[PDB]
Each structure stands twice: as structure tokens, then as C-alpha cells.
């Protein structure tokens, strides 16, 4: 299978600051198939970035991303107190899924 | 336009199995395919399995081969998921979570909480 | 195509039982603007009700 | 302006000009609809 | 004895229908969301 690991696995950033998380692949995997999502403790997964780009519908736009191969990123262009989050990149290979590792970010 | 609507929260006892019903909304429950993740609490999250509904083909997580049953009705556009076995092991938030054909975006349902 | 044709003749006869054989056609009487389906329908019969 | 509205739902094709101005509510798979929009209920019209 | 016809569907308010009836008095045609009795008739007293 292919594997997703990202990093730093946990971070601590100050707000007005920017920030990004990296996502690597064990593999190459197509850019159009990858995405970032937000998650808050008691909430399901929110989708900010798909297709290793495309801003999701209702993101609040401070993020953005890029990537291709093995390497993609996901950038917060600033922090603000509500964008400390978990973090994960997945890979919905639609016959194969790949999730791991949250980034954790906090304050 | 797509919402997941998903059953709500259960408590089983070991050795029972759990029956997950989301209902699609929105239409298109036919050419799309369905998926189910589970959330263990205090963890990431994991797939299980999932079905085409239109091909009525299902596939499974390597770690849930066996155990589950995944099926959809077409009739009432409903997904369901059936995990059998049940130990304390498997508490979690199973969610349902699914793609059209066409699309890029994948939509997801609330996630129910199931206690053993 | 939402119009509601009708053809009709009036003839006397001299009759019981069945119909009585024979040929008419019959001819255009109305042509109404209705729209609508009409599936089924149902025949209004009066009563001698003393 | 609000006021003017087409049909959304319908069960099969209409006739030439024929009018259905049915406001029933659309059942949009087999569950059986009661009136109310629910998970496959709509009012007809938008 | 033989008045009128009704052609409709459903016949109870919820679409409509054609009624047809000789009245005795004049011909009435209507196309109304009609609500139908389950025995419709007409009626002569002596
Ligand atoms: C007429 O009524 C039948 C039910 O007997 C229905 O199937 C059909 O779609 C209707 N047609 C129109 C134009 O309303
Ligand atoms: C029905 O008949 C009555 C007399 O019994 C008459 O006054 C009435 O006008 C008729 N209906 C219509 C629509 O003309």
C-alpha cells in the first residue's frame, strides 16, 4: 500500500504566524487524489484542500496548498486561534484509503 | 447538495453485532461509491470498508476482513454497515462518508458513537 | 393534446335489450380547451326519488 | 419577487398542455412520503 | 335519465377534473378541483 506519514507530529506555533505541514507519500500518488482536513476533538473531519489544491467550499481562504510525487504541503498563510487544529493529509484512492498522522497544533 | 444522514449513538454487549444505516440525500446514491471510517476515541482515523452501490461490488480493510457486512438499498438510497463480533476493543465513531462519480469532493455523515 | 373531443349523433329507435345494428357516424359536436389527464371516468344518472 | 414559481418534482413527463398544478409533496424513492419533507420528501414546486 | 359524465383521475380535490352535466335547466361544464361523492347522482320528485 502507500503510506501518508506527515510532519512535525506535534507543533507549537504562536497566532500571526505562518505555518505549514508536510504530507510524504511512500510512493508517488496522483496530486488530484489528496487531501488536507481539520479536525476539532467531538467533530467530524472538515475538508480544506483537495486534489492536492482547490480551496474547499466555505474555507475560511487563509489556506492553501500545493504538491506532487511524494511531496505535498499544506500552508496557513497566517494562525489564527481557531486554526490550531490536527491536521491530516488522506489519499482517497478510491479502491485503497490512507490516513495517519495528525500534526498536532497548538498554541 | 449531498448530506449524509446517519443512525443515531448504540451500546452493545461483546459478542454482538452493530448495524450502521446512511440514508444519501441530495440523490446520486447510484453512481457514487460509499465508504466506511472508523474514529476510535483517542485515535486517527481508519477505513473499514466500503460498496458500490450501482456495481454492487464491496471491498474490506485488510483489518476488518471478516467481521463486517457492507450493503446498500438502492430503493430507500441507503448504506448500511454491519460489524459482527463486537468487544470493547471496537468502541468508536464509525462514520459514512461517499463520492460521486464526476466529482472530486467527498461528503460525509455525523458519525455514531457505538460503546461495547 | 389537452382537448377534449366529442362526436355525437341523436337518433330515434324503437327498442329493447341490446343496441340496435346498423351504420351512422357520428359529428363533431365540441372541441374543449381542458388540460387535463381523465384516466377514468363515471356516468350521472338521475333518480325517480318519489 | 417571490411569487412565481416552477415545478421541481414531477413523477413522469407532462402532456402536451396539460396543466398539473398538484401540490403534493414529491416522494423521490420507496420510502412512503406522509406529507412531510423528510429524507426523500419535497414540496413539488420551487 | 342519463345526464353527465365525469372525467378525471383521482376525484377527490386533489386534481382536476371534468364535469359534464346536463342539469335540466342549462348544460354546465366545469373543470374544478372537485371533490366527488362516492355515489354521485341527480334527481326528479313527483
Ligand atoms: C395520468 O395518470 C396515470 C395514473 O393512472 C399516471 O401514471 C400518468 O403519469 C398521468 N399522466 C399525466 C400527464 O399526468
Ligand atoms: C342547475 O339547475 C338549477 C335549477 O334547478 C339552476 O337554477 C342552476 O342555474 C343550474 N346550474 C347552473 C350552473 O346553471
Known amino acids: 500500500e502507500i503510506v501518508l506519514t506527515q510532519s512535525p507530529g506535534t507543533l507549537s506555533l504562536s497566532p500571526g504566524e505562518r505555518a505549514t505541514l508536510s504530507c510524504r507519500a511512500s510512493?508517488?500518488?496522483?496530486?488530484?487524489?489528496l487531501a488536507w482536513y481539520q479536525q476539532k476533538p467531538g467533530q467530524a473531519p472538515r475538508l480544506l484542500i483537495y486534489?492536492?489544491?482547490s480551496r474547499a467550499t466555505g474555507i475560511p481562504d487563509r489556506f492553501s496548498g500545493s504538491g506532487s510525487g511524494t511531496d505535498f504541503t499544506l500552508t496557513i498563510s497566517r494562525l489564527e486561534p481557531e486554526d490550531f487544529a490536527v491536521y491530516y493529509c488522506?489519499?482517497?484512492?478510491?479502491?485503497?484509503?490512507?490516513f495517519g498522522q495528525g500534526t498536532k497544533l497548538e498554541i | 447538495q449531498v448530506q449524509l444522514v446517519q443512525s443515531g449513538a448504540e451500546v452493545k454487549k461483546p459478542g454482538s453485532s452493530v448495524k450502521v444505516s446512511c440514508k444519501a440525500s441530495?440523490?446520486?446514491?447510484?453512481?457514487?461509491?460509499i465508504s466506511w471510517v472508523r474514529q476510535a476515541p483517542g485515535q486517527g482515523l481508519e477505513w473499514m470498508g466500503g460498496?458500490?452501490?450501482?456495481?454492487?461490488?464491496?471491498n474490506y480493510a485488510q483489518k476488518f476482513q471478516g467481521r463486517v457486512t457492507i450493503t446498500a438499498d438502492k430503493s430507500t438510497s441507503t448504506a448500511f454497515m454491519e460489524l459482527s463480533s463486537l468487544r470493547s476493543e471496537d468502541t468508536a465513531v464509525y462514520y459514512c462518508?461517499?463520492?460521486?462519480?464526476?466529482?472530486?469532493?467527498?461528503?460525509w455523515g455525523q458519525g455514531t458513537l457505538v460503546t461495547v | 393534446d389537452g382537448y377534449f373531443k366529442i362526436y355525437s349523433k341523436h337518433t330515434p329507435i324503437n327498442l329493447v335489450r341490446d343496441l340496435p345494428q346498423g351504420f351512422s357516424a357520428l359529428e363533431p359536436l365540441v372541441d374543449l380547451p381542458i388540460g387535463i389527464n381523465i384516466t377514468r371516468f363515471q356516468t350521472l344518472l338521475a333518480l325517480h326519488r318519489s | 419577487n417571490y411569487n412565481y414559481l416552477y415545478r421541481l418534482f414531477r413523477k413522469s413527463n407532462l402532456k402536451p398542455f396539460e396543466r398539473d398544478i398538484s401540490t403534493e409533496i414529491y416522494q423521490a424513492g420507496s420510502t412512503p412520503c406522509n406529507g412531510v419533507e423528510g429524507f426523500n420528501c419535497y414540496f413539488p414546486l420551487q | 335519465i342519463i345526464r353527465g359524465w365525469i372525467f378525471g383521475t383521482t376525484l377527490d380535490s386533489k386534481t382536476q377534473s371534468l364535469l359534464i352535466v346536463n342539469n335540466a335547466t342549462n348544460v354546465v361544464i366545469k373543470v374544478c378541483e372537485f371533490q366527488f361523492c362516492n355515489d354521485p347522482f341527480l334527481g326528479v320528485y313527483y
Open positions: 441530495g440523490g446520486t446514491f447510484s453512481s457514487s461509491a
Open positions: 488522506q489519499h482517497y484512492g478510491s479502491s485503497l484509503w490512507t
Open positions: 486534489g492536492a489544491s
Open positions: 510512493q508517488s500518488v496522483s496530486s488530484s487524489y
Open positions: 462518508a461517499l463520492r460521486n462519480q464526476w466529482d472530486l469532493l467527498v461528503y
Open positions: 460498496i458500490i452501490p450501482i456495481l454492487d461490488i464491496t
